[PDB]
Amino acid sequence: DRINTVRGPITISEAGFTLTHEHICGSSAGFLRAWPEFFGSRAALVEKAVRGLRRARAAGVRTIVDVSTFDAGRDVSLLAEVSRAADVHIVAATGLWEDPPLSMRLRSVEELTQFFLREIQYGIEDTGIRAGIIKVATQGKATPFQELVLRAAARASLATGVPVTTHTFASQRDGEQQAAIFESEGLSPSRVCIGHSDDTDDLSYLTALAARGYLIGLDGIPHSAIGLEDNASASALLGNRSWQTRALLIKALIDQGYMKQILVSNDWLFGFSSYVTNIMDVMDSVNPDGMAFIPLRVIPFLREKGVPQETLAGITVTNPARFLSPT
Amino acid sequence: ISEFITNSGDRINTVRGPITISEAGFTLTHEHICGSSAGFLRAWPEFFGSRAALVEKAVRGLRRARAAGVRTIVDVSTFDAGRDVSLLAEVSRAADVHIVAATGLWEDPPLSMRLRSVEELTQFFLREIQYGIEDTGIRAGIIKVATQGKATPFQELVLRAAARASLATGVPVTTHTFASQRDGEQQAAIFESEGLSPSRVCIGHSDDTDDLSYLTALAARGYLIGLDGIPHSAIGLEDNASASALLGNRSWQTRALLIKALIDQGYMKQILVSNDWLFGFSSYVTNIMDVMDSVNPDGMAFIPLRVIPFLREKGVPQETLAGITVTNPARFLSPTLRA
Numbered sequence A: 001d002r003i004n005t006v007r008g009p010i011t012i013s014e015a016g017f018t019l020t021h022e023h024i025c026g027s028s029a030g031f032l033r034a035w036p037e038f039f040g041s042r043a044a045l046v047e048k049a050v051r052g053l054r055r056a057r058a059a060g061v062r063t064i065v066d067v068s069t070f071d072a073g074r075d076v077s078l079l080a081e082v083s084r085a086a087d088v089h090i091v092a093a094t095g096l097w098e099d100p101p102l103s104m105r106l107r108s109v110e111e112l113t114q115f116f117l118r119e120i121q122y123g124i125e126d127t128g129i130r131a132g133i134i135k136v137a138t139q140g141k142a143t144p145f146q147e148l149v150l151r152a153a154a155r156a157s158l159a160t161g162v163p164v165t166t167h168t169f170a171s172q173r174d175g176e177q178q179a180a181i182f183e184s185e186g187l188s189p190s191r192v193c194i195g196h197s198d199d200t201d202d203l204s205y206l207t208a209l210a211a212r213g214y215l216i217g218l219d220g221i222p223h224s225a226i227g228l229e230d231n232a233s234a235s236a237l238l239g240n241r242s243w244q245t246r247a248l249l250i251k252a253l254i255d256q257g258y259m260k261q262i263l264v265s266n267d268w269l270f271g272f273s274s275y276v277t278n279i280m281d282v283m284d285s286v287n288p289d290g291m292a293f294i295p296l297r298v299i300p301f302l303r304e305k306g307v308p309q310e311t312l313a314g315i316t317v318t319n320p321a322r323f324l325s326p327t
Numbered sequence B: 001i002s003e004f005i006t007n008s009g010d011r012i013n014t015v016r017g018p019i020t021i022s023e024a025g026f027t028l029t030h031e032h033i034c035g036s037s038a039g040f041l042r043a044w045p046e047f048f049g050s051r052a053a054l055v056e057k058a059v060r061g062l063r064r065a066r067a068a069g070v071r072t073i074v075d076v077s078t079f080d081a082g083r084d085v086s087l088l089a090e091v092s093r094a095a096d097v098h099i100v101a102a103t104g105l106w107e108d109p110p111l112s113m114r115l116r117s118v119e120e121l122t123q124f125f126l127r128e129i130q131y132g133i134e135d136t137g138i139r140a141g142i143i144k145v146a147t148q149g150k151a152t153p154f155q156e157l158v159l160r161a162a163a164r165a166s167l168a169t170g171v172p173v174t175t176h177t178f179a180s181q182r183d184g185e186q187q188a189a190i191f192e193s194e195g196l197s198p199s200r201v202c203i204g205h206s207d208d209t210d211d212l213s214y215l216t217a218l219a220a221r222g223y224l225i226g227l228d229g230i231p232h233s234a235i236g237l238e239d240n241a242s243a244s245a246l247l248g249n250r251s252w253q254t255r256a257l258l259i260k261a262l263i264d265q266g267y268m269k270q271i272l273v274s275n276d277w278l279f280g281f282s283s284y285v286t287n288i289m290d291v292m293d294s295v296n297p298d299g300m301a302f303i304p305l306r307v308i309p310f311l312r313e314k315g316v317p318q319e320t321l322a323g324i325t326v327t328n329p330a331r332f333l334s335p336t337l338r339a
């Protein structure tokens, strides 16, 4: 019936148009509190995120899923503040991303399961805010620790019904190994979104996963360093494929019959400290629409390609609701 | 005369505010309340039982050290070692033991630090010394840095940023070494290329090595020698591989006799001693704090209760031991003039 957000539980019908892979701030544990001047100030970051989320709201977005984990610097009090002041629901995440500190990397699968369950069932830190999704990551073949995280995420999902969403190196087909580990724990593919799947052009990789029941996260549509070819760091992070190429993978999976399993997002942020210093300004300079890019640019592009309204509403409303509802 | 006056004079920053140099007293220069990771104590306090259990454990431990004569500890936990200065302030008030907090970076920096330039790191260290840590207003009184063998390129940047922050603020620098790889020599070279005075640098974990020529060469150059892990020993724990790997096979007596050896060779003024103890420990294996507590129940009181009597009956005068534990830290922690 209910999805946990940073403002409390909401009914499934209240989620509406939902972006399923977003960030208020991509950082590191403790960093925003220790060095807020990196972002100008905490107050400036709040103002920027509220302005950006209000723009997405005006474009039709009603909910975002912030898939920042502990080690990506999730500050759930920031999420709550920005959610309240933009009147946009925010679902918070547990799990671990690609930068776990020693106090996490030394933990057993049983210990990690307890930590994920704490954030889902009890709350994050001392805030009482409960996570509504579990985030995990690989970058190619899983490290031994990442195998533990994937298993703990599966166990936490089985205990609570909250879904699992993943970071992949899509061009190394990471979703296949993630799926194998999840299924070895008894997790239903319908509880799993294989993310960053628009980073690859290998449609056969994506359709094979979708034919097994997985959700496919086409979540980085505006990420492109076209026009930034003299910028090595932006090119390495954003890639040289266009947003149109990424968006046409949405149409391709629709055309192949998988509209009920597509999840679309921007993978945008309003602050970004875990990469080179200038990256947030560079990213903003090529996508000023920010999180409004999906509703303002991708939807009109697909509609004029012939995707009907019912299909676009199915992808942006029905699929996230089915995914997020604890099952 | 001025050794006796506590109601006025120059001051050092603690988690409870500024104190005069004379108030510092018996000072342990390398300790931890909790060895963790950034944000970890707040995200998963049940790892330590509870935050309140950790507080009570630390307060009892500090009171034990205080009854043994300790008046001040330097908590050399950085941001990435999970320093929680609000925890430090709470336990300092409850135990009435002064705590100096640290800036710098240790061996587990996150991406948001690893990607930063020397200039950016300099600004972060200056923020924590000149403005305060997080939103607490508590100012760091020492800069902590680390190598584990030959420095990585990032570790070099950290050492240079530490030196620049030290010159700009007057606060001293203290280091983590892999002592058997002679890390202090490369650290010294980098520090000296930045113009930092050796008398403002403690080369830490120096009791992990038996190579006296390495230590006396650094002390002869004016460096402070941190003999800071005296009770760390896995003797009796040989079937415990994780405890053996962390604590080593050398006895506390062997470590303590390095203190006497440096005294005997004329380097008393260059020695700093400590326990490198903690009351919570999450950045290693799960059982490690209970294991460590089982072989050193005295905790931070090990230096006053065990090392001082051992050295005294070996003929080290009381006044020499008081110079090492009171005067030497006072000179180290007292800020010098800014550049």
Ligand SMILES: CC1CC(O)(O)CC(O)(O)C1
Pocket (backbone or CB within 6 Å): A023, A025, A026, A027, A072, A167, A237, A267, A268
């Ligand atoms: C925090 C984000 C930054 C990014 O560049 O969008 C990649 C990511 O893996 O989604 C994590």
Ligand SMILES: [Zn+2]
Pocket (backbone or CB within 6 Å): A167, A168, A196
């Ligand atoms: Zn990702």
Ligand SMILES: [Zn+2]
Pocket (backbone or CB within 6 Å): A021, A022, A023, A067, A267
């Ligand atoms: Zn992301």
Ligand SMILES: [Zn+2]
Pocket (backbone or CB within 6 Å): B175, B176, B177, B205
């Ligand atoms: Zn150390």
Ligand SMILES: [Zn+2]
Pocket (backbone or CB within 6 Å): B030, B031, B032, B076, B276
């Ligand atoms: Zn230490």
